[PDB]
A paper describes a structure:
In this paper, we present a strategy to fuse specific, high-affinity protein binders to obtain multivalent or multispecific scaffolds of predetermined geometry. DARPins are used as building blocks to confer the desired specificity to the construct. A series of rigid connector modules replacing the [name] capping repeats allow to combine the individual [name] domains in such a way that their distance and angle can be altered to test different geometries, bringing the binding partners of the DARPins into a defined spatial arrangement. The two helices are not just joined end-to-end, but instead the two domains are made to overlap in such a way that the joining helix is stabilized by contacts with the domain cores along its entire length.
In the context of [name]-β-lactamase fusions, we observed that the paratope of this [name] has a high propensity to form major crystal contacts, leading to crystal formation under a wide variety of conditions. Indeed, constructs D12_Hxx_D12 with H02, H09, H11, H13 and H15 yielded diffraction-quality crystals in space groups P212121, P6122, P212121, C2 and P1, respectively, at resolutions ranging from 1.8 Å to 3.5 Å. The observed pseudo-torsion angle of 172° is close to the predicted angle of −176°, but the connecting module is partially disordered, such that the C-terminal [name] is rotated 90° around its long axis. In this orientation, all four D12 units engage in paratope-paratope interactions, where two [name] domains form an antiparallel dimer. Two such dimers pack into a barrel-like unit. The purple molecule in Fig. 5b shows the C-terminal [name] packing against the green N-terminal [name], the pink molecule the N-terminal [name] packing against the green C-terminal [name]. Only a few structures show a kinked, disordered or dissociated shared helix (e.g. D12_H09_D12), but even then the DARPins stay fully intact, demonstrating that local perturbations of the structure in the helix region can be accommodated without unfolding the [name] moieties. Occasionally, the [name] fusion constructs would rather distort the conformation of the connector module than forgo the formation of such favorable crystal contacts.
Author numbering: 14 to 140, 157 to 324
Write the structure that this text describes.
């Protein structure tokens, strides 16, 4: 009966598991190295088996002979709904196995970042074996890049609190601060700068967060970046500075704050064009007037 219960759980045969339990099968039966039906269901992704077993008194924190719990197995195999059900039934979020890894680290092994984040929300402890720490810190990097583009301040704050490196970058050279400025997320710009983000990080085309905020016209982000030391005269690989971008795209208020913070009206891009020239070219007479008076 114990063998039948293990194999019915592995196969996801819910009504067969129900019958076996009703007929007295030990819900915490173990195979020869300590795997219980809940282990195998969690490994295999059979949520229905998981819920039936837990309803019938299964030990949510059963260990096999390597110290793995059902939450370890569900994390490693990427079964998010089972992770949630296990946690809701008292699974130990910080259970550690015989080599020191917890469910968060096994989830990171195959890139199961939503599970990593869920485990963080449920108390996953973030304080040679630094390989374990790298698993966490890399997952946090990827999560922070994702969260910074998305825009939710609470999510980013949580990831930074957990140890995410605010100065990481994606493969194009966009840091979280670039992404937050690009997408117009002022709240995340503020949080990143409060936590040590390089205000003048360059992507591979020489674009700083201030280039991106001037390009997109986000005045409040421009102002916060300038208050934190953004390079008002930084140039991209074609010589374009923030004042050029604000003039090209008709952002009069951004031209004004850039000028207040020391922007150089005489800077020429690689084509010899000053911000005034570009204002003229684009029919932005009001901006051209401001720049000529500041010449």
């Amino acid at each position: 009966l114990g063998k039948k219960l293990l194999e019915a759980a592995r196969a996801g045969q819910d009504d067969e598991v129900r019958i076996l339990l009703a007929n007295g099968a030990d819900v915490n039966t173990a195979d020869e190295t300590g795997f219980t039906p809940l282990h195998l269901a969690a490994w295999e992704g059979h949520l229905g088996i998981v819920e039936v077993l837990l309803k019938n008194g299964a030990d949510v924190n059963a260990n096999d002979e390597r110290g793995h719990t059902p939450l370890h197995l569900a994390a490693y195999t990427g079964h998010l709904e089972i992770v949630e059900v296990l946690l809701k039934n008292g699974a130990g979020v910080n259970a550690t196995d015989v080599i020191g890894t917890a469910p968060l680290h096994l989830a990171a092994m195959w890139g199961h970042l939503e599970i990593v984040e869920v485990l963080l929300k449920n108390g996953a402890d973030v304080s040679g074996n630094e390989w374990i720490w790298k698993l966490l810190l890399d997952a946090l990097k990827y999560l922070l890049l994702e969260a910074a583009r998305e825009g939710h301040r609470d999510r980013v704050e949580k990831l930074i609190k957990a140890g995410a490196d605010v100065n990481t970058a994606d493969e194009t050279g966009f840091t979280p601060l670039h992404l937050a400025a690009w997408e117009g997320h002022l709240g995340i710009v503020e949080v990143l700068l409060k936590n040590g983000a390089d205000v003048n990080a360059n992507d591979e085309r020489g674009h700083t967060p201030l280039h991106l905020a001037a390009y997109t016209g986000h005045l409040e982000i421009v102002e916060v970046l300038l208050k934190n030391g953004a390079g008002v005269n930084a140039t991209d690989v074609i010589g374009t500075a923030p004042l050029h971008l604000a003039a090209m795209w008709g952002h009069l208020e951004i031209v004004e704050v850039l000028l207040k913070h020391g922007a150089d009206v005489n800077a020429q891009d690689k084509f010899g064009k000053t911000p005034f020239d570009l204002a003229i070219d684009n029919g932005n007479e009001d901006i051209a007037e401001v720049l000529q008076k500041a010449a």
